[PDB]
């Protein structure tokens, strides 16, 4: 265990993120037993995880970690059940992780986060139903949006725009946002209102394209221009918790679910791979920057699996 790095990793690993260099960021929470809290970790070697003995850095958060995000190379932003968003700073030699800022602005659990195209700002999703606009630099909340009528599930920022982000909520609304418009939020859905929206991924290339996964395990393909759902497929036996796009030229879409299964989808929503390796809840996914055909999956089974994608 490196300095400020505890022995045990909490069993429930909620986050799996790969830096440019191929470092692995793991955040995990304790959802069971007496101590109900969260951790932060670093794996300068990819396949060293989940063993803390080979980890380069780590720390413990006051509370659990529902969602975590990279802020470039140094910073890490947290969705804490505490009802706080918090930032921790990585070390110069990257040996330790120390809390930059911790602000209790949400009134309930903080469920989802994404950082803006700038990386100078971010947006948060809480079960208080509110979505907030953050100055990472000034460490404050310029805007509070109460668009939704239920708890907020996912908030995905536009890759290419600092004013545009998607939001999905249990109120069976998916929102496209432009901070610029006086009514920022704009409701987008298929023909008929359907099963709940659970997972959001913006397309890397085409900033007019996004995908949503329902609670029914049907992943859907959304064109904002026509604002009409062209294509959807039945991938998962259960709720689609996560949707991640590969770095590849024409990308690959990674679909993760509470059915404890993973699949990777082609551009026409057609499944190339099916992996039953995880024995519990598959939480997060990142693609190997270095070996682009490699995929890194976590779950509550404390299992870290590395994937060779065909």
């Amino acid at each position: 265990l490196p300095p400020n790095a505890p022995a045990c990793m909490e069993r429930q690993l909620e986050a799996a993120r790969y830096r440019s260099d191929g470092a692995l960021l793991l955040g995990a929470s304790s959802l069971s037993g007496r101590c109900w809290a969260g951790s932060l970790w670093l794996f300068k070697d990819p396949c060293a995880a989940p063993n803390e003995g080979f980890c380069s850095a780590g720390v413990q958060t006051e509370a659990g970690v529902a969602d975590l995000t990279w802020v470039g190379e140094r910073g890490i932003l947290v969705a804490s059940d505490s009802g706080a968003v918090e930032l921790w700073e990585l070390d110069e030699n990257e040996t330790l992780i120390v809390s930059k800022f911790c602000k209790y602005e949400h009134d309930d659990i903080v469920s989802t986060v994404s950082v803006l195209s700038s990386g100078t700002q971010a947006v948060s999703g809480s079960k208080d139903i509110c979505i907030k606009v953050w100055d990472l630099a000034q460490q404050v909340v310029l805007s509070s949006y109460r668009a939704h009528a239920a708890q907020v599930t996912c908030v995905a920022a536009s890759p290419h725009k600092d004013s545009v982000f998607l939001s999905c909520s249990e109120d069976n609304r998916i929102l496209l946002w432009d901070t610029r418009c006086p009514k920022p939020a704009s409701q987008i859905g298929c023909s008929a209102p359907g099963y709940l929206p659970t997972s959001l991924a913006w397309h890397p290339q085409q900033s007019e394209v996004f995908v949503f996964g329902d609670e029914n395990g049907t992943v859907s393909l959304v064109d904002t221009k026509s604002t009409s759902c062209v294509l959807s497929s039945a991938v998962h036996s259960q709720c689609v918790t996560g949707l991640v796009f590969s770095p590849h030229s024409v990308p690959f879409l990674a679909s993760l679910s509470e059915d404890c299964s993973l699949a990777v989808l082609d551009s026409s929503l057609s499944e190339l791979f099916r992996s039953q390796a995880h024995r519990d809840f598959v939480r997060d996914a990142t693609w190997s920057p270095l070996n682009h055909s490699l995929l890194t999956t976590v779950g509550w089974d404390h299992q870290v699996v590395h994937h060779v994608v065909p």
Partner: protein, 625 residues
């Protein structure tokens, strides 16, 4: 002062947390029994065979701790009413497990939400849990004053908020509760935890919840104005509400992070204690009526039964009523005996129903004030009280007072009387049979004779109280008609309730009754205009009496004799609650019926729908002659 708790959706260490909240002054904690993000699968491998432990252990707190300080919270992921089979099955199983664990720990209450309209399967499942074992662990339903959907910000271009009036629509939150409750056949264990929002709704919406079973007010930190000095404070209007809720004695809860960051959580709590101690003191009435709030008692029948010592004791501890009685006689004397006739004319004054002699004493104070001469009879059938009277007459009253130990209908008087005086009146004026008693004694009144009281009138008002409806339903007894509870009046300090219309007179009687064919039998039709959506559970009763001229007594809340606590209101329940809508008239019909043997009331609601005729033929309830 004010019982209060702190709601939280995050507890790393139950040990650490609990001390903190208590340090700050919180009587109780509301927290998850399983982690709110910790979602479980009950049917599908592999995650069905997830290895335990499924939560933290009971050992971490004293049984006493669990019993007194923890309120459980259903995990938010559990949605029994999901459109998707798999989620509905899993939430069914998860809700049972969580609820089952609450009871394992002996938690005093458990919080479940009404945050959408269709909560049918949820009610079904809870109802099952309730009909499994015999426990007293309450269930608090989390319902907002205002639906989250009608409190969104109008920042959605394609789906704007409708700024049209929604009278019916802003009451949607109550319909949520009403249905859930009704599916659950009004279990006494299911009460309301009423989430108060940023923006209070229209007063009419708040008017809904008056008589509902509310154990909790939930206040998010989001609703707290900040004073100049940075203190957490509440709208003038929120204060009126909090003041109202204190009167209903509820347990104030606090949810949300400490926005007033340059202060302890005590800041919030302090305001409530601050408002509480700043409320007016309890008046004399309010002191007397302390524990008797929505307490159902059988109406007294001092005709067919003999009142206990301590019964008479307390009922004489009403100074105002006897002041009023004294004064009525004071005025009658001066009006009957000219000052020239003062020593030539002594008046024959007969107390009919004397008990232990406060009215006789007041009859005496009346003469000393009005300086005229009065011959006293004390007629009383309870021979136990007659003991107190003949002990007084021997010691103090002397031969001025002839104690007559008999029924006023029996006693053959040596002489006719100038004035007859009586306190033979129930909470519905005539329910002790004051009319029949004084009708039988009227033959021994001089033709110019006065009665105090000269007249009385009952009044009736439609009410909504699911709490009293539940309390009445509870009064079932074995070896009696399973619905006798509903066909009988109860005296009660009506408290958790809503009067749907102002009172109207029901029955009136005048004494003496010079009527050629005296009949105390009555049929009356009443129409009560209602202007909110509401549910009728029964009809409150009060009365007014004329002692003499301008001297009078009333338990009618508009004309209420002030300080006079001698009579609590009466309640005529109905078997089946009747939905009423804004605009509609409640039509009630009341019959007073008699035998040689007994007198009784019957009643029917004839609009906006019909009720069954209640107490038909005095089957469930009568008053002995």
């Amino acid at each position: 002062r004010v019982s209060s708790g702190r709601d939280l959706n995050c507890v790393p260490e139950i040990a650490d947390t609990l001390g903190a909240v208590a340090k700050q002054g919180f009587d109780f904690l509301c927290m998850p029994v399983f982690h709110p993000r910790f979602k479980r699968e009950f049917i599908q491998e592999p995650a069905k065979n997830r290895p335990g432990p499924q939560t933290r252990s009971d050992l971490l707190l004293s049984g006493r701790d669990w019993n007194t300080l923890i309120v459980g919270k259903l995990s938010p992921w559990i949605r029994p009413d999901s459109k998707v089979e798999k989620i509905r099955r899993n939430s069914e199983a998860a809700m049972l497990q969580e609820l089952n664990f609450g009871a394992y720990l002996g938690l005093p209450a458990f919080l479940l939400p009404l945050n959408q309209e269709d909560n049918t399967n949820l009610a079904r499942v809870l109802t099952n849990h309730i009909h499994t074992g015999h426990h007293s662990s309450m269930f608090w339903m989390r319902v907002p004053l205002v639906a989250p959907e009608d409190l969104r910000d109008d920042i959605i271009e394609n789906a704007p908020t409708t700024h049209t009036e929604e009278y019916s629509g802003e009451e949607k939150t109550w319909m949520w509760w009403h249905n859930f409750r009704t599916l659950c056949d009004y279990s006494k264990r299911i009460a309301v935890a009423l989430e108060i929002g940023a923006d209070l709704p229209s007063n009419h919406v708040i008017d809904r919840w008056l008589g509902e079973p509310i154990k909790a007010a939930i206040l998010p930190t989001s609703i707290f104005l900040t004073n100049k000095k940075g203190f957490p404070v509440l709208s003038k209007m929120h204060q009126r509400l909090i003041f109202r809720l204190l009167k209903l004695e509820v347990q104030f809860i606090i949810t949300g992070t400490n926005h007033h960051s340059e202060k302890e959580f005590c800041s919030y709590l302090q305001y409530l204690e601050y408002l509480s101690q700043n409320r007016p003191p309890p008046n004399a009435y309010e002191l007397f009526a302390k524990g008797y709030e929505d307490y159902l008692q059988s109406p007294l029948q001092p005709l067919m039964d003999n009142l206990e010592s301590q019964t008479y004791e307390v009922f004489e501890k009403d100074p105002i009523k006897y002041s009023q009685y004294q004064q009525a006689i004071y005025k009658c004397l001066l009006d009957r005996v000219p000052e020239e006739e003062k020593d030539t004319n002594v008046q024959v004054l007969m107390v009919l129903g004397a008990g232990r002699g406060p009215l006789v004493n007041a009859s005496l104070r009346a003469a000393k004030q009005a300086d005229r001469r009065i011959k006293l009879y004390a007629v009383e059938k309870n021979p136990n009280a007659v003991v107190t009277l003949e002990n007084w007459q021997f010691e103090e009253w002397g031969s001025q007072v002839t104690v007559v130990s008999s029924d006023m209908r029996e006693w053959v008087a040596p002489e006719k009387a100038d004035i007859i005086v009586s306190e033979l009146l129930g909470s519905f004026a005539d329910n002790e049979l004051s009319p029949e008693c004084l009708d039988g004694a009227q033959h021994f009144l001089k033709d110019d004779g006065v009665s105090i009281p000269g007249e009385y009138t009952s009044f009736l008002a439609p009410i909504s109280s699911s709490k009293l409806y539940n309390e009445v339903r509870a009064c079932r007894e074995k070896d009696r008609d399973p619905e006798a509870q509903f066909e009988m009046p109860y005296v009660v300090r009506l408290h958790n309730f809503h009067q749907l219309s102002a009172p109207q007179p029901c029955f009136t009687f005048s004494h003496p009754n010079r009527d050629p064919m005296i009949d105390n039998n009555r049929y009356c039709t009443l129409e009560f205009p209602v202007e909110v959506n509401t549910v009728l559970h029964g009809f409150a009763g009060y009365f007014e009496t004329v002692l003499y001229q301008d001297i009078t007594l009333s338990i009618r809340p508009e004309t209420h004799s002030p300080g006079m606590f001698s009579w609590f209101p009466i309640l005529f329940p109905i078997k089946q609650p009747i939905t009423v809508r804004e605009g509609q008239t409640i039509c009630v019909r009341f019959w007073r019926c008699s035998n040689s043997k007994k007198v009784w009331y019957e009643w029917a609601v004839t609009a906006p729908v019909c009720s069954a005729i209640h107490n038909p033929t005095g089957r469930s309830y009568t008053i002995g002659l």
